[PDB]
Amino acid sequence: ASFSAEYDIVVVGSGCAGLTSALFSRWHGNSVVVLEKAAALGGTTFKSAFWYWVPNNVPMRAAGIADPKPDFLKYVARVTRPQFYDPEHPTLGLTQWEYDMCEAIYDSASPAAELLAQKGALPYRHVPFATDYFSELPEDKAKSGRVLTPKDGSPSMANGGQVAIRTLSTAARRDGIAFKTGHRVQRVILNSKGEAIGIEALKDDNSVVRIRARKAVIFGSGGFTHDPELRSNFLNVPVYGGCAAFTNEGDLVRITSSLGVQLRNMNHAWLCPVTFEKAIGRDGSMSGMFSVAGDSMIFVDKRGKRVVNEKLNYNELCQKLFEWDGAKVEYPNLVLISIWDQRSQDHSASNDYGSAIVPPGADDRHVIKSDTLDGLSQQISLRLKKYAGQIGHMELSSDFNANLRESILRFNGFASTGKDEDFHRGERASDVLFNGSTKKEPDQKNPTMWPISSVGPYYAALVGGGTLDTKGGPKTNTHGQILDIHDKPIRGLYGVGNCVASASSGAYWAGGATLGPMIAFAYRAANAAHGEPKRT
Amino acid sequence: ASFSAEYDIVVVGSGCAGLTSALFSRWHGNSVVVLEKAAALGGTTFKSAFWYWVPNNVPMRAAGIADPKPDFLKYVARVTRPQFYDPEHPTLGLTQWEYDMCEAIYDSASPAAELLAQKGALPYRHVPFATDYFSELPEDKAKSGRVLTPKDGSPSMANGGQVAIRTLSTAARRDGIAFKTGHRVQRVILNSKGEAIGIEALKDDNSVVRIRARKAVIFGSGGFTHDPELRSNFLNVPVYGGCAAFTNEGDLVRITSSLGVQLRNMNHAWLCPVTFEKAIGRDGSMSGMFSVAGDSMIFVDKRGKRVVNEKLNYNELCQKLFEWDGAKVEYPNLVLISIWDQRSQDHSASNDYGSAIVPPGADDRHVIKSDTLDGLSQQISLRLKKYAGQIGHMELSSDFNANLRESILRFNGFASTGKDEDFHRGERASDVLFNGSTKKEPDQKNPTMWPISSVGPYYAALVGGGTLDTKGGPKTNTHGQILDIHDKPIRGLYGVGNCVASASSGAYWAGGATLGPMIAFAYRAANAAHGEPKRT
Ligand SMILES: Cc1cc2nc3c(=O)[nH]c(=O)nc-3n(C[C@H](O)[C@H](O)[C@H](O)COP(=O)(O)OP(=O)(O)OC[C@H]3O[C@@H](n4cnc5c(N)ncnc54)[C@H](O)[C@@H]3O)c2cc1C
Ligand SMILES: Cc1cc2nc3c(=O)[nH]c(=O)nc-3n(C[C@H](O)[C@H](O)[C@H](O)COP(=O)(O)OP(=O)(O)OC[C@H]3O[C@@H](n4cnc5c(N)ncnc54)[C@H](O)[C@@H]3O)c2cc1C
């Protein structure tokens, strides 16, 4: 029973979690390999803007923006476990584990960011204007300032992930880390003491390779969005997919099923609305709809009524789509219809951040069009019929047309006063902050709303619920060590990123709140793995 | 090193799943032991009404009533997977597994029920008037008739579970099945071929015993409602507890963590509202609130407004309590307040079916009382403050009193016309079916509503979200065999009832839809287990 290759540390996956874990490991003097399931490096990280939320970061301190630790913990506790949050409780109402993980994020994200930049692997610039998603909470004492992004990201920052994967992987090759693509890890090999001593991977040609790890196996294999069975059986909502890399199929869940782990936070994903047709069609370029485009634009349900603030934070807005009507045995908002006019088409269109409104040249198969409102509803009906088998054979109400006219009349009044009496669109900072581009109007009272045109053409797109990726898996301690059911480390076995349980439950603290913590844990995991004895 | 006892079949748990599995096994000629963690037999089953939903049962056929199998499958497919339900799809939109499991229920529930009755273990009577929970759906072609209950159950049927446990356990002892209480199974023992050959159990004195199973170990160990870590980490909603027996702590989840199983349907429980204070205080006698008592009674939120049909099916009503307000980072309906008057107190009180309205002599610590509405709100506020750390420090709104008066006036008008224009209380058959007792009023237009008295005293109780129990665990095939990750049986290992994955997802088809299927699977499991070779 022997191995065709041997390294000190074997890393699984080449997104943020894998690359950073590998670099930190290598810089301690270990030999390292990165095993990537796909043909290309980068996973979901590659598609991201690579905002990374780093509490008490060096640029903030240089700018004179304070980030006190007790207040950091209160902010995250209040957002993460609202029912239990208590400022007088010794762990703010969090479990000891959740509290310890949040503390580790605060302690380790900045040194991790600093080392990656110092070595030239992830040079950054500060994004001082990027504001926390629940900045209005009094617990938040550093409402803006925590976000970094790759130094050479574009001005929109939309290509940040591509830049990060380039800088990280360039530094990895420079520093002698080995890479194997088309290697799907499928097993952890144990010694007789039950310690991880290597992996088995399936190659594209269907050969199996065994690779030894002298000190540690570190998983950075991403989530399970694109295993439909796992997704449907674990998540708290029945999402249609998400912007995760399609190779993120929850392999670690199968890999650990015989290792005695504790699967934790399996009920939660990072959530976001998606352009429904791109989810169903498996458009690999799809982004979550982080900014819902248009000011002269509303969402309506199948009755032709507004049901939600369209500018609400994406992780929260997605949840509205899965409200349950128990009397009718249906999801009334399963798909919502975004409706906009020529003004929003011309001035709110974007290639970035999952906008449904796209400029000339962009893929617009998901866009529904008509010269009149009555014509639009007939076009929407055809689209619903096309996807009937995915959406409970949903149909527009027989009163749709008249309801939509009433909805627009009401909205147009709100747009003129600047006050949305129904859903408070534009009243929270995050509504304005992620509003997207608009035609700036001299006398606009609220930047998130402008009256919808009294003439066509009119445009629409179906909006459904998806993920960025999942955030449940084997529980680790704060050093990235995968625990057995008695809360003790399985020696040699580590996990970082979306493949292990996040301490953020169902919450999404700020932009960059996936990547920032992840880099902290890669640093802590690599530092602990470096201290393993060489084994078997 | 060895075993202190040996049987052909070892059954774990003494609720419906375990007792029926054991009886079926014994009647095939195997020696059988039943191992119970608690001091007494019966688990959650003991507390139930023991309705059991049996498609195509003998009473229905005697009435000349068809229960056509394709239509049975369409009903359960429509309720279980609403998004994907399609009458033209080869498995109605279900996965092959879901479809096969639902078919097995139809095929095996009636023969299982007939044999239990034939042997004198579970004599039954028909419950002809119990209509399915979604009987109005056109897919349901046998809208009433499927429910059986223990022949000697009381007229209310509330003691059906006690009767069933008595008849089942009496037959088990009569037929030579062995029983051991205070035996907490904690491990499955495997041979070198990886087959289950017995168990290890922890006894009360903290000794461990090994018991050999020549043919099979059959788990019927119930769900994980009362492991708060598992509950919070897996279920789709953050429930506070449930009427499951307190010994249902998800031991099988830990037992199988190194066995390579597929945990499935972990995101779903059988849901129901509960008397919140009884959940928090772990009242072991608590029932889920299947019947929300009172016609002169409303539920209000912390703003003093109605938000839901109070008579809606319990599994669906519970979901209303967990709607999420992303703008305020809170659950607006986390607890609702049931408010009633003297008429409902006197004529709707019940010790059964989880009623918050309780008769004289009953434990009434959960009941809030005051001589004016303004006084009632002051008493409710004190109760919210008592449980603040569990409910996000919820407070009544500053306009609560005025809103409550407006809510009562509006409801009173609905009660007089018989038409609840807001939430349609009483319009579905199931609202009437679980309406509970009421004072007969000559000219009452809708049995579920009567105007609330303009004089006190007034009464209230906090209502929160809970379970009957969970319905996620190791996936089995239709023969109750626990599968490995490659969908192949782990030889000798079986599971029946709440301890394994239900094929009903998040749905609750009808009264008796937990016990009816469970008896079908106990029969199929026992039949397959009987065919195992004797091993090790
Ligand atoms: C469009 C978009 C924008 C986003 N923007 C941001 C943002 O700006 N900030 C932020 O914090 N978050 C953002 N997110 C979320 C963020 O991208 C992810 O949470 C993060 O990139 C996940 O990193 P990871 O290393 O865990 O996984 P990934 O980057 O998904 O990498 C996992 C890798 O493991 C590989 N793998 C899987 N199985 C195996 C196996 N068996 N063997 C070997 N390799 C395997 C996969 O192929 C993949 O390459 C965004 C998400 C999307 C979709
Ligand atoms: C008040 C109430 C009323 C209900 N009414 C109905 C109804 O009318 N019809 C219906 O269909 N459903 C009803 N339900 C739901 C139904 O009672 C359950 O779904 C069903 O009884 C579960 O049966 P079971 O055998 O899987 O588990 P249980 O009856 O819970 O039995 C499991 C047993 O396993 C034991 N156990 C646990 N761990 C171990 C271990 N490690 N070793 C050994 N033993 C162990 C437990 O102590 C317990 O005795 C009701 C539920 C409640 C709470």
Residue numbers in the entry:
A (entry chain AAA), B (entry chain BBB): 63 to 598
From the primary publication:
Additionally, the final product is often contaminated with side products due to over oxidation and therefore requires considerable purification efforts. CDHs belongs to the succinate dehydrogenase/fumarate reductase flavoprotein superfamily and use flavin adenine dinucleotide (FAD) as a cofactor to perform the dehydrogenation of cyclic ketones. The natural substrate for CDHs is cyclohexanone, a simple cyclic ketone. The SelenoMet WT CDH crystal structure was solved using single wavelength anomalous diffraction (SAD), using the selenium atom as the dispersion centre.
The FAD cofactor was found to occupy a deep positively charged channel through the interior of the Fd in agreement with other published structures. This pocket has three solvent-accessible channels: only one of these channels (labelled ‘1’ in Fig. 4A; this channel will subsequently be referred to as the entrance) is situated adjacent to the isoalloxazine moiety and is wide enough to allow passage of the substrate. Channel 2 (subsequently referred to as the exit) is also adjacent to the isoalloxazine but partially occluded by it, meaning it is too narrow to allow passage of the substrate. Time course analyses using the DCPIP assay gave greater detail about the differences in substrate specificity.
